[PDB]
């Protein structure tokens, strides 16, 4: 009998669930090629996270591990959870929050996190991770940092990594839809968050975008996700049981309470709308509105078209 | 009619409200030398943020601005809000989320954020900010990045800054309690979040600590804050009116459901406990417990001592 709700925070104060950035737009992308299968920002309406999704904003697209010396002055990393708890294979696709961008270089900045190594001196290590490299095995807990600086880092150093920026592979653009190949063969427990297929009734998937230093992207420096991280954290906190086939939301002007558009959020944890034909759908709406739960509805509830005709 | 609550997320999945890091401890510091007056992580129980506190996890201890050339190849920054909205003086102490560490160097990593500047090439600028230097004027919207790399950045470049690490000043240790001098004279509107005084009844302030690359700290790489960021986000979302002089919380083992300790959270937005005499108070409790609202209480409700005798 805990009733379902969404966070009533304005869109442009909530954050991406695949990079640590503010949300500043929502778009649709119906005629786009890739499957939709992000591993971060995946959460059911009753609060079960899927893939590698963490509830922790400060773990989104981070990773942590201990260093070892790999061939040709490459820096191997044995992964742990960002909390420092051990990471074991065969249970999830990768550690919690682990970045899910497969189509380009991760230019990373790391710091030492052992307090005894933080009494003095420069704790930073930088480098790049190439998820398309053959020595990228996050399911089994290991990856490589190419061209580290310093070249020489003592074995067993505990490092916490951030993605400072992403870039395209040579002669391609960087597609932020493409998830990594996590390697191995995943147990049933460690299964990827499923892919999401286009719903019916003229509906198209809604993406929440952030501007992000993603250099050479197909999207013009924009990272899409299926749910704001605050939605993930809200559903995990609430654990409201699913009581309908989908959940109708209204996107409200917060001051004047006018309804700016109708959306559906499905049990599997993604939002849809029906774009006004020939326009950008929700992209033209102001970004300072607030989502509110109206009611559960069935799958065939017909949404009012949102946006302008063009 | 909206009843008060706190997020029922385990402590060690919630995040600091003064740096973007996981919480991994809670401590007390009764014989602490400094006043308690953080500007980030400040929120009333009914959801009014104070100081520079933002609701947005991805704005905590970040800042943004446009570059200009300052004397001696110093890199001046004209601040904006992290959202890119303009920042104007005389309304807040500094932009939303602006870092509130005054006692040491900020070693910062910035990226370009203009999509047209992100089609190719390396978008990173690094440097350090010295909040104790005379050209640090965050209230009026301007600061300086010393020793930038590149040392030549075009004027008017939009940059988003993160604090990669902090370090002590020469011949001192870095005290993370010390807030910056924001400069100028603050209007009534732009007032600092007030300082917090020790409450009675044998209570002492509870700090939520993160391990963080703060080099040479008085705390050994630990950043304290008064509220998890998720508490800030929760109170802003809920807006539950204050209906008592303080709010009694229990810190519950989430599986065994047993009570590990009693705490009070006050309307002004800080947590207290009564340490068992001679011990570290809440510091010895497991960090995977969950805070639960019991009831409103008066200021003179007597907490059972928490922790061990030593
Ligand atoms: C090794 C190096 O410096 N290479 C330069 C190019 O940059 C590399 O380009 C690759 C794709 O072709 C890939 O994106 C690499 O990640 C990228 O290397 C990164 O960026 C450079 C600038 C350095 O900082 C490296 O340390 C870093 O790993 C560069 O290509 C241009 O920029 C990159 C970011 C990419 O957008 C590419 O498409 C652009 O043409 C070229 C020309 O500037 O110069 C070197 O080859
Ligand atoms: C300019 C420089 O390289 N200085 C070195 C010292 O580092 C500086 O120390 C200052 C305090 O005395 C202050 O913290 C500066 O921020 C710090 O400079 C930073 O760290 C160094 C290592 C470089 O990366 C700089 O680019 C950066 O700005 C260094 O002091 C020792 O480390 C620092 C972090 C601090 O903890 C200090 O107390 C330590 O003694 C010394 C000895 O290694 O070497 C240079 O002087
Ligand atoms: Cl019911
Ligand atoms: Cl709602
Ligand atoms: Cl989690
Ligand atoms: Cl240690
Ligand atoms: Cl049903
Ligand atoms: Cl219906
Ligand atoms: Cl009532
Ligand atoms: Cl209620
Ligand atoms: Cl509660
Ligand atoms: Cl805010
Ligand atoms: Cl009482
Ligand atoms: Mg899992
Ligand atoms: Mg203000």
Numbering used by the authors:
A (entry chain B), B (entry chain A): 231 to 540
Q: What is written in the article reporting this PDB entry?
A:
Noroviruses have been identified as major causative agents of acute nonbacterial gastroenteritis in humans. Genogroup I, genotype 9 (GI.9) is the most recently identified genotype within genogroup I, whose representative strain is the Vancouver 730 norovirus. We determined the crystal structures of the protruding domain of the GI.9 capsid protein in the presence or absence of Lewis antigens.
In this study, we demonstrate that the GI.9 norovirus preferentially binds Lewis antigens over blood group A, B, and H antigens, as revealed by an HBGA binding assay using virus‐like particles. Our analysis demonstrated that Lewis fucose (α1–3/4 fucose) represents a key moiety for the GI.9 protein–HBGA interaction, thus suggesting that Lewis antigens might play a critical role during norovirus infection.
